Design a protein around this ligand. Structure first.
Ligand SMILES: CCCCCCCCCCCCCCCC(=O)O
Ligand SMILES: CCCCCCCCCCCCCCCC(=O)O
Ligand SMILES: [Fe+3]
Ligand SMILES: [Fe+3]
Ligand SMILES: [Mn+2]
Ligand SMILES: [Mn+2]
Ligand SMILES: [Mn+3]
Ligand SMILES: [Mn+3]
Lengths: 287, 287
C-alpha cells in the first residue's frame, strides 16, 4: 500500500526519541563479529571430553541455537507493524535488533561446526514445553501483527519475545553458561560469544520494556494483560527448566570431572528471579 | 504459523552459500557510522551560498532522502518471503541490507539538520514520475510478497527495488553528486557519506542479481519477464531524470559561480547506460 509521504523529507528523524538513542548505542556497541572468535581451544576441549561429558553441554546449545533462529525470523512482523504505524525511530533500532540475532545464529552455528557436532541433530533436546514456546507461541504472537496491530497484540508480542524468551529464558541461559563452563575453564570461544550476546540482549529487553510501557501509559488496564500473558507462559518456562535440570542430574560426569558443585536449585531460583523482576520493570501507572 | 524445525539445530549454516559470503563481506565492509561524519564544513558551505545556489542542491537530496526511507520500509516483505521459504542465508544477509538503508536515512537526515533545512518540506521536488516509482510501484511490488511469493512476484520485486531504484536511479545519483559537488569542493561531509552509500549499494545490487538469476536459472522464460518489468518502469525513470534536468537548467547560478560546465546530456547518458548494463547482468541462459 502506498506511501503518503516521508518523515525525512517533510522533517527529520526525531533525534530525541528513546529508540533513536538505543539505535545509536547499538551501532557503537555492536561491532563484534562471530567470524573473529577463535574456537580452536573449544575444539580441543570438546574432543578431550568423554562421550558422557560431551552430551552434558548439548541441551543448552540446542535450546539457544533454535532460539536464536526463531527470533531472527520472528522479529520481522514487529518491524513491519511498527513501520506501518510510521514509527521510523523504532524501525531504525529494529534493524540493529535483527542483525544482532543474525550474528547470534551465526555464533552458535560456528561453534557447533568447530567442535564437530554440526552434522548432529540436536532437536532431541527440545521437549514439549520448549516446542510450545519456540515452535508455536512465539511465531503465533509475532505473525498476528501482520493482520492485528492493536495494543493488545503488540503487548502480547513484546511479552512473549522480549520479556519471556529474551528477558527470562535467554538471561538465565547466559547465567547458566557462566556458572558451569566459565568455572571449568572450558570453551573460551563460546563464552566470549555469550558475553557479546548478553550485551546485545540488554538492548533487546529495553525495546520490549519501552514498547509495553508506552502502551500501558495510554490505558493502565493493559498492565493486567501484561501480567496475565507473563503468567500464561510460566508453566512452559519452568517445564523446560525442569527438563533441563533433570538431564543435568542424570548426567553428572562433567560436574565430577571438573569439580563443579552445580546448584540446580540456584539456577531454578535465578529463572524465578528473572521472571519476577521483568514484571517489576513495567509500571502499572504512567512512567 | 509454526516452525517445523531449525536449520542450525538439525545442521548448520550453509557456509558456501553466495548470500552467506555476501553477509560476511557486509559485516567486514559495513562498520561506517553516519554519526561520525563531520558536517561542520557543510553547514558553512550551504550558508555561504545564495538562495538561488542553495536551491540547486535540494532536488537531488529530496529524491535520495525519500528513496532511502522507502527502501528501509519496503525491504521487509522480501526478508519475510525468503524467511518463509527457509532461505536462512538470504535472511542473514538481508539483516545487513536493512541496517545499511537505516544508516542511509540517518546520513541524509543528519546533513539536512546540519545545514539548516531540516524544517523545510522537500516533497515539492517529487514530481508525478518520482511518486509513481517510490510512493506506489515500489511498495506495491514488495508488499505483494506477503500474499504471493511466486517466482514472478519475486522477480518483479527484485527488479523494481534492486535493478531500477538502486541499480539505475541510486547509482546515477551517486555519479551526479560527484560530477557536480566534488568538482566544486562543496559539502565534503555529504560526499564522504555518498562514498559509503555507494559501497553498500554494490552488495544490495548483487543480492538483486543473485535473486533474479536463480529464478531465471529454473525457467529461461522468466528472463522475458525481467526485461518487460525493466521496460515498464523506464518511462518513469527518464521522466524523473528529465524533470531534474529541467530544474538544473532553469537554476544555473551554482554552476556559474563554481565554474561547473554541468553536462546534463552526459548525466542522461549515464542513466541510460546504467539501465542497459543492469539488463546485461542477467543471463537468459543458466549461469
Ligand atoms: C539449567 C537451568 C535452566 C536455564 C534456562 C535455559 C534457557 C535456554 C535458552 C534457549 C533460548 C534462547 C533464546 C534466545 C533469545 C535471543 O537470542 O534474543
Ligand atoms: C541530473 C541527472 C539525474 C540523476 C538521477 C537521480 C536519482 C536520484 C535518486 C533518488 C533515489 C535513491 C534511491 C535509494 C536506493 C537505496 O538507498 O538503496
Ligand atoms: Fe535478543
Ligand atoms: Fe540500497
Ligand atoms: Mn510437562
Ligand atoms: Mn511526464
Ligand atoms: Mn539472541
Ligand atoms: Mn540506500
Amino acid at each position: 500500500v502506498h506511501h503518503d509521504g516521508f518523515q525525512t523529507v517533510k522533517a527529520t528523524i526525531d533525534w530525541e526519541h528513546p529508540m533513536f538513542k538505543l539505535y545509536e548505542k547499538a551501532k557503537r556497541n555492536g561491532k563484534w563479529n562471530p567470524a573473529d572468535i577463535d574456537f580452536s581451544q573449544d575444539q580441543k576441549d570438546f574432543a578431550s571430553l568423554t562421550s558422557e561429558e560431551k552430551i552434558s553441554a548439548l541441551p543448552l546449545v540446542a535450546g539457544f541455537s533454535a532460539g536464536e533462529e526463531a527470533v531472527t525470523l520472528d522479529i520481522l512482523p514487529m518491524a513491519h507493524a511498527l513501520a506501518r504505524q510510521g514509527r521510523l525511530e523504532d524501525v531504525l533500532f529494529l534493524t540493529t535488533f535483527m542483525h544482532d540475532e543474525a550474528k547470534h545464529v551465526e555464533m552458535f552455528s560456528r561453534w557447533q561446526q568447530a567442535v564437530g557436532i554440526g552434522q548432529m541433530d540436536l532437536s532431541v533436546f527440545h521437549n514439549d514445553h520448549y516446542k510450545r514456546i519456540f515452535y508455536e507461541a512465539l511465531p503465533e504472537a509475532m505473525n498476528r501483527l501482520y493482520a492485528d496491530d492493536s495494543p493488545e497484540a503488540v503487548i502480547r508480542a513484546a511479552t512473549v519475545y522480549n520479556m519471556i524468551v529474551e528477558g527470562t529464558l535467554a538471561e538465565s541461559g547466559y547465567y547458566t553458561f557462566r556458572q558451569i563452563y566459565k568455572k571449568a575453564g572450558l570453551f573460551p570461544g563460546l563464552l566470549q560469544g555469550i558475553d557479546y550476546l548478553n550485551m546485545d540482549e540488554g538492548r533487546h529487553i529495553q525495546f520490549g520494556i519501552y514498547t509495553i510501557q508506552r502502551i500501558v501509559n495510554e490505558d493502565e488496564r493493559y498492565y493486567e494483560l501484561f501480567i496475565r500473558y507473563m503468567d500464561e507462559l510460566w508453566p512452559h518456562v519452568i517445564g523446560y527448566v525442569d527438563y533441563l535440570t533433570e538431564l543435568g542430574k542424570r548426567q553428572q560426569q562433567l560436574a565430577r570431572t571438573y569439580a563443579l558443585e552445580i546448584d540446580y536449585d540456584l539456577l531454578r531460583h535465578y529463572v524465578i528471579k528473572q521472571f519476577n523482576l521483568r514484571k517489576k520493570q513495567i509500571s502499572r501507572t504512567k512512567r
